[PDB]
């Protein structure tokens, strides 16, 4: 494979160059939202982000080497985690708020408009505040997001994927050792980042159940692509 032959810096640059853009929400935002208007802006935004994520995944080293069937399984199981960790990363320099879009910055009080969304909101704000206190670097963020893509669905099927996961691990340690962190601080910071992935998985499971709740209580029509990504978790 071509992903294993890369170097730690060439792996960082290839992931940074593959980063999807920050999309905008539908403008003319009426300052107070309703339950349907807020979910309308969110499902529309998430649907367009999914198109960019699918093309971002191809640019992940080692992802094209997998079969078409395996690429489908990994994205279907990881898509909400990847949207969430991206949202969390965008909201780092905005404490107490979630930056869904540059023109859509929401507070936790605005999460009270949709039932069951305040719990997911607080979990997302807590993840962003955790990234801020750790001073998460963008080079580390793109590594964590690729780890989510390749790891979250590999057990519901393997050697190649695990070889790429080890390759990314070598890249995380390389970045931390460049920042001057001691040998003890490197594996301690490596563990702290990877444990947050467990909570990102938890938020995705709680978020997935909430989206399924809106499917049968259809106040906002979900796109067919968003429905197929949602149906794959049942």
């Amino acid at each position: 494979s071509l992903a294993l032959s890369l170097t730690a810096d060439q792996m960082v640059s290839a992931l940074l160059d593959a980063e999807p853009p920050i999309l905008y929400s539908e403008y003319d935002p009426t300052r107070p939202f309703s339950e349907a208007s807020m979910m309308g802006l969110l499902t529309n935004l998430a649907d367009r982000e999914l198109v960019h994520m699918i093309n971002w995944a191809k640019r992940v080293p080692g992802f094209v080497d997998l079969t078409l069937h395996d690429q489908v399984h990994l994205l279907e199981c990881a898509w909400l985690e990847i949207l969430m960790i991206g949202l969390v990363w965008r909201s780092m320099e905005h404490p107490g708020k979630l930056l869904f879009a540059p023109n859509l910055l929401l507070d936790r009080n605005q999460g009270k408009c949709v039932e069951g969304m305040v719990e997911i909101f607080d979990m997302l704000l807590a993840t962003s505040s955790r990234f801020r206190m750790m001073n998460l670097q963008g080079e580390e963020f793109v590594c964590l997001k690729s780890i989510i893509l390749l790891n979250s669905g590999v057990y519901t099927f393997k050697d190649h994927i695990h070889r790429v996961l080890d390759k990314i691990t070598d890249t995380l340690i390389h970045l931390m050792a460049k920042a001057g962190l001691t040998l003890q601080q490197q594996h301690q910071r490596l563990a702290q980042l990877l444990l947050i992935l467990s909570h990102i998985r938890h938020m995705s499971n709680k978020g997935m159940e909430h989206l399924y709740s809106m499917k049968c209580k259809n106040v906002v029509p979900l796109s067919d692509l968003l429905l197929e990504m949602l149906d794959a978790h049942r």
Binding site: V51, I54, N55, K58, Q71, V72, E76, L225, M229
Partner: peptide, 10 residues
């Protein structure tokens, strides 16, 4: 018969 198949190829 899924859209994700199409976007992964195009």
């Amino acid at each position: 018969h899924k859209i994700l198949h199409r976007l992964l190829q195009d």
